[PDB]
Write a protein that binds this ligand. Sequence first.
Ligand SMILES: Cc1nc2c(c(-c3cc(F)c4c(c3C)CCCO4)c1[C@H](OC(C)(C)C)C(=O)O)CN(C[C@H]1C[C@H]1c1ccccc1)CC2
Ligand SMILES: Cc1nc2c(c(-c3cc(F)c4c(c3C)CCCO4)c1[C@H](OC(C)(C)C)C(=O)O)CN(C[C@H]1C[C@H]1c1ccccc1)CC2
Lengths: 142, 142
Amino acid sequence: SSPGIWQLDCTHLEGKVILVAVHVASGYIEAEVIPAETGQETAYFLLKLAGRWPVKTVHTDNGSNFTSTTVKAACWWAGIKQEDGIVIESMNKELKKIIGQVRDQAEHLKTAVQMAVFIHNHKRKGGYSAGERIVDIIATDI
Amino acid sequence: SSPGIWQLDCTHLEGKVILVAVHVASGYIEAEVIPAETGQETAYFLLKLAGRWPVKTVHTDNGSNFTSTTVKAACWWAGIKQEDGIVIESMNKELKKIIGQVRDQAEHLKTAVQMAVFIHNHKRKGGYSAGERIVDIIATDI
Ligand SMILES: Cc1nc2c(c(-c3cc(F)c4c(c3C)CCCO4)c1[C@H](OC(C)(C)C)C(=O)O)CN(C[C@H]1C[C@H]1c1ccccc1)CC2
Ligand SMILES: Cc1nc2c(c(-c3cc(F)c4c(c3C)CCCO4)c1[C@H](OC(C)(C)C)C(=O)O)CN(C[C@H]1C[C@H]1c1ccccc1)CC2
């Protein structure tokens, strides 16, 4: 169901990889800079996300990355269901748009990515932000 | 007020440092393994936390770590108020207790810490978990 569904995606910037988790119903995001797209990086990120938010189902833009036994262990341990198939381009475009706008304010790319995550989750779209929508969606399900 | 108050603390294990953020009203935690307690590590962690949860006020067990101009920049950029003074020993004892219980299941300490964060936030105390309490507290304030 809708409150526990997340989409994982990866995007490239400055010879680095940005791993993004999107809470599908709200548009709320978590993101991190990693050296390369690997099973180990995805597994560790999933384990972190699942301890912080209710993660019931995960989708990816890269099915081969979910085949990894390290990713399988993270989903098995956290009780996450892997679901095939999957917007993503637009989220990656909007995130890179925010990143480019703030890039000069920081030395490290990871700092600019976290500033971009902050801007995205706090942005009101009398409208609500993605941060307000995720908390609203999950509290309703409790 | 109560929904935006966080406590930061650091604890040592296996020659490494575990940086813990506790949502005071719920007992919900975020934690990471870092090489050493620095202004830069604390600043980056604060920037991440504030983009993910409403962080209005932060307290620490180590005031000298909040004096750093890098920590000051993170709080200024994210609009966090630093508040002097501050339970913590018991949270560190409970977290290390959970860590020791799972330590053998993983090679890396960081993996065991994330498993411990997952266990703590999901643990029901008909009672509610820290994960349910934080979402409940924040949705009420919306
Ligand atoms: C370094 C490492 N290598 C492997 C594995 C894990 C790993 C990954 C996880 F996501 C995880 C756990 C472990 C131990 C313990 C339970 C919580 O989740 C780790 C882990 O480090 C990461 C990648 C940085 C997180 C660590 O520190 O040990 C997991 N292995 C799975 C095959 C045993 C088989 C398996 C077991 C269960 C389900 C599916 C496959 C492959 C190698
Ligand atoms: C490497 C680095 N060194 C310094 C600083 C920041 C830094 C830290 C932040 F928390 C931060 C920002 C920056 C640029 C931009 C806005 C969002 O928050 C970074 C940052 O890397 C981290 C530590 C890994 C996050 C980066 O990549 O640039 C911040 N500097 C502050 C004195 C200018 C003065 C200041 C400015 C505003 C308020 C208070 C003090 C000292 C050196």
